[PDB]
Each structure stands twice: as C-alpha cells, then as structure tokens.
C-alpha cells in the first residue's frame, strides 16, 4: 500500500529573483554581482541579462493569479538582497521590502504559502567591491543583518524559509570553474569562501530561532546522488569518495556541523583545507536545521580514477562515467526519477531530517503552436515520474514536506538565455527581445493543477 501524500503537503513551484524579476535599477535597488557580471562581453548567450528577465517585478499580480488558478499550495521565491540593502550593509531600502511585502500579501490573499529563499547568488556588488563578498568573514554579520531584517518584517506571515540555495553551485562555479561571479579559478579560495558561507548559514539559523520561533528553516543543496558504475571494488571505492567529496562535504556541515574526514584530509594534503577560527565548530554544530532542502535533477555514476587520470573527476578519487541504464535529456543530463527516491532515502538514513524538494523540473525547447498552445507532454512525463518516486519514498518512511517544481514561469537562465524553458507558464520572449512578455499556460500547467486538486491520488 503506498502512503498518500500528507494532508498539508506543500505542492509548489519556484523561481529565483535574478531569473524572473527585472527591475534591475528600479526603486533604489543596488547592483548585484550578477548585474555587473552578465554585462561583461561574452559571458552570457547573446548578451542576455536580468535587466528585464520576465518582468515579474511589475507583473507579479498576474503571475500570482495564475498560481491561484493552478491552486498552488506554495511558491518558493528568492529575495534580492540588493533591493533590501542596495550596498549590502548600510541603510535599508523600504521600497525593496515593500515589493516583497506586496508579493507575500498577494500570495497569502490567494491561500498560497510563501517559501522565502534568502540567497540565490546575488550578493550586492558593493560587498564584493569592499571586501570580496564571500571571501570575507565580514559577510557573516552583513548577511545575518539582512536575514534578521527579513525575519522581523515577514516572520509572522512566512513559516518556511530557505537560507543559502545551492551553495555548492555558487561557490564551485564562482571560485573553481570561474563560470559565475567572481569568475575565480582557485580551489584554495573556493574552500575558504565555502567555509565562510557555512558560518553565515549557521549564524542565520541561530538568529531565526530568536525571531521566528514557530518557523521552519534550512539550507538547500544541489544534490546529484552518486552511483558506482558496478560492483568492482575500486568502483565502489570511487563512489564512497565521490559521495563524500561532492555531497557529504556540504550536507554533513548542514546537518552535523562537521566536515567529513577523508575529504578534509585529502584537501589538507593539497594545501586546500579552509582556515578555521575559534568558535567556528561551536557555531556550525549549534545551528540545526528543520529540514534539508534538495534541488534535484539527476544522479552521477562514477568509476575509479588513477592518480594520473581525468568525464570529470579528481585524480586518485573518482571520475564520472555515463550510466548505460538511464534515459537522457537532449542536453545529455540523465533522467533518473528512481535517483530522487535514492537521494531522499540517503538523507533520511544519514541525518533523519525532513526534506523539502526545492527544485526539480525539465528544461526543453518549447514550441508555441497556433492558438497559443504549448504541448509539453515531455515535461508532464518527467514531472509525473518524479512525483511517483516521491510517493514511494514517503511510503518508505521519508518525511517529505513538499515539492517545488522548477519553474512556475519560464525564466532567464544564468548563462544560456531563454530558449531552454522550464515553466508551467510560457513567457513570450526570446533571446533577441522581450516581445510582449505575455504569459501562456502550457499543457503541464493543467496537469499539475489536477495533481494538486487530487493530492497526487493519481497522475
């Protein structure tokens, strides 16, 4: 017998501020690191950027009406720090807070639970300019002051809060790969910034207990569960390495306040472990979250990687390998819904934490057919499979608090423009112009509306 979805299950959808809002210089908003980075020649496809995006800042009432038509139970969005504190620290911008107050009131007037994400990659450029943003301990108290302001203004109306969204991505892409701001390729700097973001996460959860005593808070991790390629002992060992280095390095700090030892000793052998200060362990261990957020798209399969080896990986630790036993998307991402169940089981088995699935979805090149019809059965199929696996995980005993499909409307991607679309709601624009920004319900919109209405009772 499958257990049903629980009666207050948060059937959601999600977005991120830079990806949706526009209004990049309006109402006293300050520059974020992404306003500046995306304007560097050549960094984004066809120079696309978040100046306008899908103009949710101006069109939020129409978008919340679509959410109410769908009957969403929750909408997860992120707050743009630069709207609230244009310079990151210093004077609060009341017009910025008032946008989010208006958005929260519009949600709540339609019965939709806001899920507020503190941070989605958009630290104010002034903090970068002053002290290098996440590479300074200065950001711990600046971030905390920003979070506390939000908690004080919104904590009576928002129960569910996400702190750092996909820290592993903004830190790795920003400091190891150089693909995101600040465009650094230096693993030593990566691991120091990562440590400071860990401390900032723990500081804000501690502050949350003072200001939002009935609320629920947690980080959200971009989780690709690792698989060994096969039962070759060296491949299993590669999996142990990979899961610990890629996944436990973040989630064990979130859940337990401790880095895992093998990965720590590997980094220490390379001169890459972060600088620890007095009080750091105590802080990290004291700030227990209410849930683990999970952003999930796919699993990763790994095999042995010798010390002169690579596919991506770490010599002597693991390399990636294509999994012959899963379907692939048109971008060569795995489609692995059973992998979601595995990841959920791993989190519950390791940390005994409830899970909020903060992001999961399918990106594809959607065609707008005559009569403003988008037939995205491929998206319904992906979503369906994943939601069925969630139910299996709940039946196994995992506490899943909700599921936020990525995304509600189509939105701007960070580096690749607009054409690989993720929304329930098509936005008429493309990489060359904003067109009219009209909202058009896709077939998937109506599919999810029926999943919600029936609490997943079948799909």
């Amino acid at each position: 017998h499958l257990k049903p979805f629980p009666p207050e299950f948060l059937w959601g959808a999600a977005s991120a501020a830079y990806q949706v809002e526009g209004a990049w210089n309006e109402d006293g908003k300050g520059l974020s690191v992404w306003d500046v980075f995306a304007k560097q020649p050549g960094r984004t496809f066809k120079g696309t950027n978040g100046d306008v995006a899908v103009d949710h800042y101006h069109r939020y009432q129409e978008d919340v009406a679509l959410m109410a038509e769908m009957g969403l139970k929750a909408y997860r969005f992120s707050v743009s720090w630069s709207r609230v504190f244009p310079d990151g620290n210093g004077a609060v911008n009341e017009k910025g807070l008032d946008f989010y107050d208006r958005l929260i009131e519009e949600l709540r007037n339609h019965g939709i639970e806001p899920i507020v994400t503190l941070y989605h990659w958009d630290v104010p450029q002034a903090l970068m300019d002053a002290y290098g943003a996440w590479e300074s301990r200065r950001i711990i108290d600046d971030f905390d002051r920003y979070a506390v302001t939000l908690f004080q203004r919104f904590g009576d109306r928002v129960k569910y809060w996400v702190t750092l969204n996909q820290q592993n991505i903004f830190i790795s892409f920003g400091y190891r790969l150089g693909l995101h701001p600040p465009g650094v390729k230096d693993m030593k700097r990566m691991y120091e910034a990562n440590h400071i973001a860990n401390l900032a996460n723990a500081k804000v959860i501690q502050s949350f207990r003072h200001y939002v005593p009935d609320g629920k808070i947690g980080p959200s991790f971009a989780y690709s569960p690792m698989y060994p390629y096969d039962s070759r002992p060296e491949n299993v060992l590669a999996f142990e390495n990979a899961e610990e280095f890629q996944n436990h390095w973040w989630m064990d700090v979130y859940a337990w306040g401790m880095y895992p030892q093998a990965a720590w000793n590997y980094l220490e052998s390379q001169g890459l472990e972060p600088t620890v200060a007095p009080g750091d362990w105590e802080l990290l261990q004291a700030a227990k979250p209410d849930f683990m957020g999970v952003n999930y798209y796919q699993t990763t399969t790994v095999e042995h990687n010798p010390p002169d080896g690579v596919s991506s990986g770490i010599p002597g630790l693991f390399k990636t390998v294509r999994n012959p036993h899963v379907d692939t998307t048109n971008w060569d991402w795995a489609i692995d819904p059973v992998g979601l169940r595995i990841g959920l089981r791993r989190i519950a088995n390791r940390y005994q934490l409830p899970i909020l699935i903060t992001e999961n979805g399918l990106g594809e090149f959607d065609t707008l057919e005559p009569g403003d019809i988008v037939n995205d059965d491929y998206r319904i199929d992906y979503l369906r499979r994943h939601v069925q696996e969630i139910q299996r995980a709940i039946t196994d005993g995992v506490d899943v608090l909700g599921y936020c499909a990525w995304s509600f409307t189509d939105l701007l991607s960070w580096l690749n423009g607009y054409q690989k679309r993720y929304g329930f709601v098509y936005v008429n624009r493309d990489d060359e112009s904003e067109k009219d920004l009209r909202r058009i319900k896709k077939k998937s919109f109506y599919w999810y509306q029926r999943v919600i209405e029936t609490n997943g009772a079948e799909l």
Copy 2:
C-alpha cells in the same frame, strides 16, 4: 604516498573460548549452550566439540610464549561466562576467574595487551533453561552482573574490551537460520532477542564508564559491506536497502542508539519489529562506544528483487544477493575482497566518525604438515598481506584504525565443521578423529607476521 601505521598500532591475533579452551567440565565450569548443542548428534562434523578443542586451558603458557616469540602487541580472547558464573547468575566461581587472571598475567609479563571479549556465543545453559537466555529481559542484568565482575577483577590490567562479538551472527544464526543455539527459525523471535542484546550491550558500556574509566570499549560487528551489482537505479536502491537492513540495523544502534527508519517501517509492516519498553531508547542512546569492532571476511553484492522474489538470499521487494563477478574466491567459493575491507572502514568513519578495531580477519584453509614440522602457508600470507595493505590505505585516507587481530593465533575448533579448515599462525597437531599430541608448530605465516610487527607494517 602511504602513511605509516601509527606507533602503538595493536598488531594482534584472536580466538574464542569455546573454540580453543577445552576443559569443558573442569574447575567448576558450568554447561554453556554450545556444550549442549554440539553434543546433539548430527550437529557438528564428525561429532567434533569443545570438550578438549586445542586444550588452551591447560596449554596457555606455551601459547603465550609463542605469542611473545612472534612479538604480538595484543591478544584478543573471549571469557567463558559459564566458567565465571556456572549457572549464569548466582555464585561466582573463583577458579574460573583465576584462569583468566593467570592468562592475563602471562600476557602482561610478556608485554602483550589483553583485549577481553565479554561474549562469544556461550551463554550458560542454566539461563537458557531458566528464562530462554537472550529472549528475556532478565539477561540484561545477568549479563551486566557478569561484565561488572570482570571489570572489577581485570580493569586495572585490561584497557581494551569488546562487548558482544558478532551479535548479528549469534542472533541471526540462532533465531533465523536455526544453525546455532537455540536452533530457532522465527524472525519475530530473532528481532526480539536482538533488541534485548542491544540493551545488554548498552547497559554494560554504562557500567564500564564507572569501573574502567580510562578504558576503551566497543561491540564487534560481523561486517559484510554491501555493493550494488551495477548502476541500474533499481540495483542502487537494492543496495540502499541491503546496507540499511544488514548493516545499519546493528551499527546505527551501537553508534547512535537508533534503528534506521526504512528498515523499522518494513519490519513493522510485517509484524516483526521488536517490543520497546519505556527507557529503552534513552539507554541505547546513552552508551556510546570508544570504537567499532569489525570482523571482516567479504563483501556482498545485491540486486533488485521482485515482491514475488527471493544460491541467492534476500527480502522480497527489498534486495537479493548475486555473485560478484569482480572478486576472487577461496577454495570454498567464498569471496576474497581486500578492497572491501578498506570500503567498510571508510564507511564506518564516514557515518559514525568512530575509530575501528579490526577484531577478526583471516584465511581458513587446509594446511599440510611436512616432515621436520614445517607448514608452508603462503596462501595465508598472501591473504593477510593484501588485507593489511588495504588497512594502510584506509589509515592514509584518514580512518583511525586502532589495531588488527588476525584470526586466529592457533588453529581452533570450528563451530560446526571440525578442525580441518585451519586459521592459525600456529598449527595444532590434531584432527577430527584424534587429539594426537596437540603439539604447536609455527607456520611460515608466523614468521611473516613477526616481521610485519618488527617493522610496524612497513615490510609486508
């Protein structure tokens, strides 16, 4: 570059009381469940039993002098509860205790660390008769009284202690498979006995913190790390279920005081979960060990198993075993997987952050005695070497490995299969038909190990 073994690494060797001592009815020793069970005709190969075994009770001085010749840093042995409390509870038998005293003094006179194992499967028969031994909560205080006795007598001289050795084996072989005493095949009974053994373990660890404040204690788990067959999602899920059900079901209780929840829910759905009394979780949670003991022989590979499903064993809908084509086998078609030991060590440190004492690892094989008292067992050298090499790699990776006890120091009696499959560094001249002269003969592997210890593992 590999790290060296730590300077005080406990290079050890091990035995179990029923397997080695003999003296089954001497000095007021009471019957254990194994004394009775092994005398059931048909139960053991050639009717072999522990009445004499390799007669270590009488020959302990000789055996310890061989240990000292080898340079053993530690000797792990078990205490026979029926020697110390012949009826399980009731009067202490001083003559029983004095054997262990004498053994411990022999070891300490030769600079060898005793590692005392409280329990190796030999509960007194009187407790079985009285109240069904491990199926009654009465055993929790009886075992604790016994443990405390030992802690009081030997705590000043024994730093390292193991509680229950291979609980997962005596509980599953005794109550699921019916292979060991009490010969039961009943999963519901298995899980209840298991729960009581968990409580017993936790109670003695609490007692230890009082009596032996500078000592180190832990349970020892017979650990077969699970692997998925391949990267098919369903087979990785089968691995998740198997690791949890076979391994975390014990080690999470030992390390965290908590059963894992998916496995608990599965058992509850089948009416198999144990009875929990008020106080049980608090006791379980408040008895953290200093180390995890590991008995290691091989890994196990699993694959998906239909709800109408399973040579292969498993749980329908959860997992089934499959032969791993990527590991070697012994001449008994069991697996040889040294890297698997490194994996299991990594997993315990990764999950629990515990130091590990490897309490048992070794190779069983027929050995030929050649003229001039020569036994050339290069096969056993190869097997030990490969495992020791992988321990070094685990230590290099950051696992805290306290020591390594090869199984076994002398040849010994197997539970069900007589004497011919030998495990010792020291051959004992006897077989299934005769005690012969019981003489001790150093095998080639003796001298190999001697050299490993002399170089602290630098020369394998």
